[PDB]
Amino acid sequence: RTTRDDLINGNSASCADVIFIYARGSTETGNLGTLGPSIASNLESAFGKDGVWIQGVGGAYRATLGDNALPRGTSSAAIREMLGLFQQANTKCPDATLIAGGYSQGAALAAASIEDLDSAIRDKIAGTVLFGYTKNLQNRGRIPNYPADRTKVFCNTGDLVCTGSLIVAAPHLAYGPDARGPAPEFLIEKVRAVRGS
Numbered sequence: 142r143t144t145r146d147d148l149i150n151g152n153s154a155s156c157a158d159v160i161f162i163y164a165r166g167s168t169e170t171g172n173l174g175t176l177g178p179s180i181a182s183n184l185e186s187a188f189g190k191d192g193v194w195i196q197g198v199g200g201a202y203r204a205t206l207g208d209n210a211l212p213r214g215t216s217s218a219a220i221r222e223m224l225g226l227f228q229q230a231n232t233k234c235p236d237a238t239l240i241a242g243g244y245s246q247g248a249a250l251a252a253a254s255i256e257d258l259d260s261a262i263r264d265k266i267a268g269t270v271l272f273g274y275t276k277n278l279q280n281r282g283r284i285p286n287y288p289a290d291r292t293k294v295f296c297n298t299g300d301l302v303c304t305g306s307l308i309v310a311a312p313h314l315a316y317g318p319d320a321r322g323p324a325p326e327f328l329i330e331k332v333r334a335v336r337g338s
């Protein structure tokens with residue numbers, strides 16, 4: 142449901158082909174929040190339960206609302222947590238294709254983590270989806286050091302966080318349809334582009 146730790150719980154001897162690491166929004170529950178489960182279900186349908194590992198960013202990532210105001214849009218502790226998960230995936234399953242995503246503060250966290258990641262691991266992330274990207278204007282719709290073709294940003298008209306503000310308006314809470322269709326569609330397409338089918 143809202144908590145998935147497939148990577149941490151997974152057996153290294155039976156690695157999945159695809160590993161999805163997702164960061165939830167501020168004040169959301171579990172480690173997947175409101176959007177993560179929808180994306181997860183669709184990935185499982187495409188690759189099979191044993192074909193994909195769903196891993197939310199928990200641990201030190203408290204998804205504290207106030208942290209949106211920090212320099213990188215999240216805390217240093219949260220970034221260290223997500224970096225650690227990417228590193229665990231790389232070590233536990235070196236042949237797996239990675240995909241990532243984040244919503245709101247989680248999108249800023251995903252961008253910061255990917256920017257800091259060792260290039261060899263970063264290059265394994267076939268696609269990343271960001272919803273209500275809090276650093277959209279500041280980063281010009283990109284994730285630093287990461288290709289535009291592997292990035293998909295979902296920013297609703299009227300969602301003030303996409304336009305340089307930290308005000309939470311109604312459009313910020315309207316990403317449900319995107320998480321159910323275009324987001325997983327993009328991720329599946331990007332994985333298949335490199336793994337074939």
Ligand SMILES: *[P@@](=O)(CCCCCCCCCCC)OC
Nearest residue numbers: 166167206207209245246307309
């Ligand atoms: P997103 O992380 C929402 C981020 C926007 C809110 C940032 C403002 C923090 C200070 C609020 C006090 C006025 O999760 C859905």
